[PDB]
Design a protein around this ligand. Structure first.
Ligand SMILES: CCCCCCCCCCCCCCCCCC(=O)OC[C@H](COP(=O)([O-])OCC(O)COP(=O)([O-])OC[C@@H](COC(=O)CCCCCCCCCCCCCCCCC)OC(=O)CCCCCCCCCCCCCCCCC)OC(=O)CCCCCCCCCCCCCCCCC
Ligand SMILES: CCCCCCCCCCCCCCCCCC(=O)OC[C@H](COP(=O)(O)OCCN)OC(=O)CCCCCCCCCCCCCCCCC
Ligand SMILES: CCCCCCCCCCCCCCCCCC(=O)OC[C@H](COP(=O)(O)OCCN)OC(=O)CCCCCCCCCCCCCCCCC
Ligand SMILES: NC(=O)C1=CN([C@@H]2O[C@H](COP(=O)(O)OP(=O)(O)OC[C@H]3O[C@@H](n4cnc5c(N)ncnc54)[C@H](OP(=O)(O)O)[C@@H]3O)[C@@H](O)[C@H]2O)C=CC1
Ligand SMILES: CCCCCCCCCCCC(=O)OC[C@H](COP(=O)(O)OCC[N+](C)(C)C)OC(=O)CCCCCCCCCCC
Ligand SMILES: [Zn+2]
Lengths: 129, 96, 115, 342, 209, 87, 141
């Protein structure tokens, strides 16, 4: 066993005071924990295998000089990747953020028969091939 | 070509012009507004339509490797000219 | 599940001894900071800022988190004493160039979309 | 106030405050703080300057890219004034001089230039006009500076009725002519004072207080057509105010009375300088003029600004005037001056 | 092995490092948790954080190890783990002309034993880890910020720290000073989603769900 | 006016702690609606919710009475305490 | 006229035809001085002296849980029962059916491209309607 002379601490992990984040960005925020949806323009499913944590979108305005998109939100480009939902929830509660969790959406298994394309008495017969 | 809105500010080739009440015009007071006077839309329209005796013609933009990727253009449709998607040159089929 | 290596303290009683010790060190160093840095504030203002910073973290009950706060606070004191900080860094605790942001719902409603 | 003039951001340097301001006389004392505050919130500032561009350089950091625009103007050229205000929603007039030059008299800069700017602003459709008068302005003063201020304050009302006229007292700050003027008297041994400074009462105000009041007047819609009196929280005797100045600076204080006529003759001698005069006959009158008590005019508190006491912000102005022996002396070392309770 | 565009594979070194990996594990079963050799012939020893001093001291002093140069010490932040941080030691052996990697872990609140007694080079590397990651090292001579500004709040290299930070500096003329204010960007940093939705390397595929 | 303006009944479709309210609705709601034709009686069923009876009076005043583990007869008596007092 | 936010500019709850509660997410902020719809009423209540008891979106959704708990069960369909009770109460009053036949308001696809403020303000829906009535009477890249 260990010989580091451990101690017992029984209280929820909380590091909001030592992360250095300002107050306005710990209490007014809302972290969305979700599995990204498939980009419908493609068939690949490799981007829908890890959980992500993105924050709520704040104001973007137009730079008066060049018309660029200006922001005052330091967390507008912050995306974190987690292997599991419980890992994401643990990180959110550790840093004091409020979070909403979206349960994973998995495509349901489907019965696909090529022989149904040519059916004697069913509407699945295809008029073209 | 380069136009001028009622306030006298030249309109760019992208159609940009500050309105009468726009304070951002103040940036040109004592200076000039840089407008390119060689409108591409006008110049490309000056080029003649080339006559080609084939269904399919190819354009690389001229110059070979100094042009654009070589694409092939279909000329079957007789009610319009075939246009290159990179350089804008037009082609037509000789008497169909 | 609850067994963890401590940093310096084994319980809050041991951790609060370091906190009070740190407050004494900061309390005695404000008069010199206002002197060496030629700050245009008074000792009362500076010592009230030290008290404010300690009060922000008065809701902590984890001896390991308190130890980090004391360790971080001790590093801040070291820089001030040795004049590694400049007048700009010391005066960054006061936010003298920021207009006071609104706190009530109506004031925030008028000026923007933030909660 | 079309789409481009709708506020955006969180009041930072890269935000859009919706303010398009033309600040005349922005290269001086009260003009560097106004531009600084306007550019802190992301305002479009037009800065028409008469001087060399080298003297406008301290104003360039005060705004994000493209926010501070510099134009060249002439007080007697009505076309230059129009180029600098026709795109602005608020015009701020800070033009002034504490002396008279060969080319511009007191009534040229306090009566004619203020009236020319006001007229062109109204003809150009400007919505807000802010004019800085003086607290002690009246037609029957001993100073042309104050006599001309009263006249100018009246021409502006007749030309721009919705103007917001502000009447500050003597302003103390870093680049000021009030606390620095008294401290620099040490070169001449003693400190002359008319009646030994026992019959003059002054109520100086802080530069940031005046700067925050002007900004608030722009954003407050009820400040139109209302005359404000920006004064400090405490009234002092000139002898006590100057004595406190030499106490903070730790310089020997050797006052001696001087007849009013004698102080004018001395001032006449200093006026011959072809550069910024050290003192003029007009400054002597202004320094020894009791600050008016105008209870009928709204003050700083009516614009949401808490007047800063002189004591809290006098060391920052006068620490520069101390020797190495007394540079490090703390704020809490000099006892505060004696105030005149109501 | 004649293919011009494919890196040649050195199997002699792969064998030698695997043998030395078992050698270390057999000698230090109390701390060694995992040993592996990459396809490019690099050896990694994964240890319990309580074995930082024993494991490093053995590798530095042992006759058949003689890892007398600390090439680098660094941390990696992986938020998905309970112990989000991963302290990495790279050691160089001049006698045997070989390199080894020692890896451990810690969370935000658990201290890690300082390596200064073994390698003096670790003095400044551990300040960087504390500065840029917030990992506390016990028994360090002088633990301070080494790279960030004075009074800087936050540990930048944490994955949850924003790229542009929370504060920015400018010169303010009113206070004749350099001041810090909340960050505002004239042009926001544009975030690109570049990952292809098609798997690139089947050999590294993970078991489903 | 101090009269009643709305009644809302919250209950779960399966929990044993909401059986009384379900018994009330299955047999008595039809009668209590015919006796109060112009009184909105909202019956909102969720999953795993403690039963409650909300009563919104004039000018936004709302009072709620917990109906957890109540029998079919207490629920009937609880409503009568709301449709009669009109506080 | 009090400007508000569109569905792409607020985090708002909509219940579809099957009783499923779902919430939008803020994509872009409202254009100019426009504000979130529930904040305008909250601001109006405070000025009128009848301040509502919620200041933040999470508190407004707590109120929704009071009025109808199903409104805060996102992506969940809560079964509704008591069809028998509805049938009984429906037979108390006997209304007659008008002789006029049932005719949906949208007979053809040209009635489908414009049904609300957003679609009637769209220049693509205006092209679609023109395309399905007048027909198709230059794409290169
Ligand atoms: C005769 C002297 C009799 C003794 C004087 C009284 C003793 C005071 C004791 C107070 C004390 O403890 O500290 C000493 C006292 C104060 O010292 P401290 O404040 O504690 O430390 C910093 C020093 O003050 C240092 O302060 P400082 O560096 O600012 O001193 C400025 C100035 C001291 O300032 C002045 O006194 C100059 C003004 C007085 C002359 C003008 C009188 C007004 C005339 C009317 C105006 C006409 C203007 C016309 C144009 O002294 C000079 O530098 C000029 C001397 C050049 C001599 C060559 O030092 C003095 O300034 C008094 C001596 C001044 C007279 C110099 C005599 C030199 C010998 C001849
Ligand atoms: C010729 C000089 C006339 C006399 C000048 C004089 O006596 O005024 C000095 C004045 C006296 O003190 P007093 O004003 O009555 O009370 C407040 C002082 N803290 O205030 C003082 O106490 C300062 C004492 C100054 C003494 C030197 C006088 C100036 C040098 C001569 C020129
Ligand atoms: C005999 C009777 C005397 C009657 C009293 C006359 C007092 C005249 C007032 C003198 C004050 C002059 C002044 O206001 O300062 C001018 C000059 C420069 O001002 P400074 O504070 O150094 O910095 C300015 C930065 N823009 O600052 C100076 O250089 C001070 C002038 C020194 C002159 C020495 C001769
Ligand atoms: N003690 C005080 O400071 C008081 C100030 N005021 C008033 O506030 C305003 C500014 O005061 P302050 O900043 O202290 O004085 P400054 O001398 O520091 O500023 C004067 C400004 O006005 C310009 N100016 C002067 N004459 C002309 C002219 N003929 N043509 C064009 N510009 C001219 C100057 O331009 P440039 O520098 O390029 O030559 C400069 O920008 C003035 O109206 C003043 O009367 C009123 C009460 C108290
Ligand atoms: C008499 C005499 O030598 O006079 C000199 C004249 C008289 O100047 P003024 O007309 O009295 O005022 C001048 C000031 N103004 C125009 C701003 C009102 O000034 C000069 O050239 C000053 C000479 C330098 C003096 C250096 C000591
Ligand atoms: Zn081409």
């Amino acid at each position: 066993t260990r010989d580091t002379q451990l101690i017992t601490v029984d209280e929820k992990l909380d590091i909001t005071t030592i992360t250095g984040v300002p107050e306005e960005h710990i209490k007014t925020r809302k972290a969305r924990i979700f599995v990204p949806a498939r980009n419908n323009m493609q068939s690949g499913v490799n981007n829908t295998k890890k959980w992500k944590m993105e924050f709520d979108t704040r104001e973007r305005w137009e730079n008066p000089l060049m018309g660029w998109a200006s922001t005052a939100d330091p967390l507008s480009n912050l995306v974190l990747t987690f292997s599991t939902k419980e890992d994401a929830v643990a990180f959110a509660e550790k840093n004091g953020w409020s979070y909403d969790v979206e349960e994973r959406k998995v495509p349901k298994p489907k019965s696909k028969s090529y022989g149904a394309n040519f059916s004697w008495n069913k509407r699945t017969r295809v008029s073209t091939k | 070509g380069v136009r001028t809105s009622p306030t006298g500010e030249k309109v760019t080739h992208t159609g940009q012009v500050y309105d009468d009440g726009d304070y951002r015009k103040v940036r040109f007071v004592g200076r000039q507004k840089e407008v390119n006077e060689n409108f591409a839309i006008d110049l490309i329209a000056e080029q003649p339509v080339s006559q080609v005796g084939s269904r399919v013609i190819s354009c690389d933009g001229g110059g070979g490797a100094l042009g654009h990727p070589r694409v092939y253009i279909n000329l079957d449709k007789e009610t319009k000219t075939g246009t290159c998607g990179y350089c804008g040159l037009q082609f037509r089929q000789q008497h169909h | 599940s609850t067994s963890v290596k401590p940093i310096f303290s084994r319980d809050m009683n041991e951790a609060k001894r370091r906190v009070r010790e740190l407050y004494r060190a900061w309390y005695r160093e404000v008069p010199n900071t206002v002197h060496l840095f030629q700050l245009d504030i008074s000792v009362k203002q500076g010592r009230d800022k030290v008290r404010e910073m300690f009060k922000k973290n008065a809701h902590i009950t984890d001896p390991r988190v308190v130890d980090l706060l004391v360790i971080k606070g001790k590093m801040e004191l070291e820089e001030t004493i040795k004049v590694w900080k400049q007048r700009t860094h010391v005066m960054r605790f006061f936010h003298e160039t920021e207009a006071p942001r609104p706190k009530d719902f109506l004031s925030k409603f008028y000026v923007g979309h933030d909660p | 106030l079309h789409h481009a003039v709708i506020p955006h951001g969180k009041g930072g340097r890269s935000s859009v405050s919706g303010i398009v301001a033309t600040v005349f006389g922005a290269t001086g004392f009260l003009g560097r703080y106004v531009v600084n505050h306007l550019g802190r919130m992301g305002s479009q500032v037009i800065v028409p300057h008469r001087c060399e561009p080298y003297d406008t350089m301290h104003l360039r950091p005060m705004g994000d890219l493209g926010q501070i625009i510099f134009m060249d103007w002439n007080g007697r050229d009505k076309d230059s004034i129009r180029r600098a205000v026709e795109h602005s929603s608020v015009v701020i007039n800070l033009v002034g001089r504490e002396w008279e030059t060969q080319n511009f008299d007191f009534e040229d800069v306090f009566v004619k230039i203020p009236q020319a700017i006001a007229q062109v602003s109204k003809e150009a459709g400007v919505e807000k006009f802010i004019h800085i008068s003086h607290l002690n302005a009246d037609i029957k003063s001993s100073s042309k500076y104050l006599r001309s201020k009263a006249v100018g304050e009246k021409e502006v009302r007749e030309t721009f009725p919705e103007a917001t006229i502000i009447k500050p007292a003597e302003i103390f700050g870093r680049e000021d002519r009030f606390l620095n003027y008294f401290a620099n008297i040490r070169w001449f041994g003693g400190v002359p004072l008319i009646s030994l400074g026992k019959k003059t009462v002054k109520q100086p105000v802080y530069i940031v207080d005046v700067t925050k009041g002007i900004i608030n007047a722009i954003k407050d819609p009820d400040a139109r057509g209302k005359t404000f009196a920006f004064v400090g929280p405490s009234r002092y005797l000139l002898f006590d105010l100057v004595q406190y100045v030499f106490a903070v600076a730790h310089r020997p204080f050797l006052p001696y009375p001087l007849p009013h006529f004698a102080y004018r003759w001395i001032g006449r001698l200093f006026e011959i300088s072809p550069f910024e005069p050290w003192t003029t006959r007009d400054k002597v009158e202004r320094i020894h003029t009791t600050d008016k008590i105008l209870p009928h005019l709204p003050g700083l508190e009516d614009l949401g600004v808490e007047a800063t006491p002189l004591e809290l912000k006098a060391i920052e102005v006068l620490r520069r005037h101390r020797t190495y022996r007394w540079l490090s002396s703390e704020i809490e070392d000099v006892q505060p001056a004696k105030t005149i309770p109501t | 092995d004649t293919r011009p565009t494919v890196r040649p594979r050195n199997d002699v070194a792969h064998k030698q490092l695997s043998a030395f990996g078992e050698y270390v594990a057999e000698i230090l079963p109390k701390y060694v948790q995992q040993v592996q050799v990459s396809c490019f012939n690099e050896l990694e020893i994964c240890i319990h954080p309580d074995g930082v001093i024993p494991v490093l001291t053995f590798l530095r002093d042992h006759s058949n190890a003689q890892f007398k140069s600390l090439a680098d010490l660094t941390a990696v932040d992986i938020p998905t783990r309970q112990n989000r941080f991963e302290i990495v030691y790279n050691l160089l052996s001049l006698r045997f002309n070989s390199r080894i990697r020692v890896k451990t872990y810690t969370d935000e609140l658990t201290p890690i034993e300082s390596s200064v007694p073994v390698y003096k080079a670790a003095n400044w590397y551990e300040r960087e880890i504390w500065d840029m990651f917030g990992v506390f090292f016990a028994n360090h001579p002088d633990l301070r910020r080494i790279l960030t500004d004075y009074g800087f709040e936050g540990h930048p290299f944490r994955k949850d720290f924003p790229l542009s930070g929370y504060v920015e500096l400018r010169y303010d003329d009113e206070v004749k000073r350099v001041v810090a204010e909340p960050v505002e960007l004239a042009q926001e940093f544009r975030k690109f989603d570049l990952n292809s939705p098609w798997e690139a390397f089947p050999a590294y595929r993970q078991p489903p769900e | 006016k101090l009269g009643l303006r709305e009644i809302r009944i919250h209950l779960c479709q399966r929990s044993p702690g909401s059986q009384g309210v379900r018994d009330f609705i299955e047999k008595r709601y039809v009668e209590l609606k015919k006796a109060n034709p112009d009184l909105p009686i909202l019956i909102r069923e969720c999953s795993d919710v403690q039963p409650k009876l909300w009563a919104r009076y004039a000018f936004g005043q709302e009072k709620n009475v917990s109906l957890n583990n109540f029998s079919a007869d207490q629920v009937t008596r609880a409503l009568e305490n709301v449709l009669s007092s009109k506080a | 006229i009090l400007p508000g936010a569109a569905y792409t500019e607020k985090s708002a709850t909509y219940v579809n035809t099957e009783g499923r509660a779902q919430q939008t997410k803020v994509a872009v902020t409202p254009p100019g001085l426009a504000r979130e719809d529930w904040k305008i009423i909250r601001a109006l209540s405070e000025i009128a002296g009848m301040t509502l008891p919620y200041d933040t979106l999470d508190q407004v959704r707590n109120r929704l849980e009071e009025v109808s708990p199903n409104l805060v069960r996102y992506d969940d369909v809560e079964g509704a029962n008591y069809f028998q009770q509805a049938s009984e109460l429906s037979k108390l009053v006997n209304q007659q059916l008008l002789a006029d036949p049932l005719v949906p308001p949208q007979l053809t696809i040209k009635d489908f491209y414009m049904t609300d403020s957003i679609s009637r303000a769209s220049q693509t829906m205006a092209k679609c309607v023109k395309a399905v009535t007048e027909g198709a009477h230059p794409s290169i890249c």
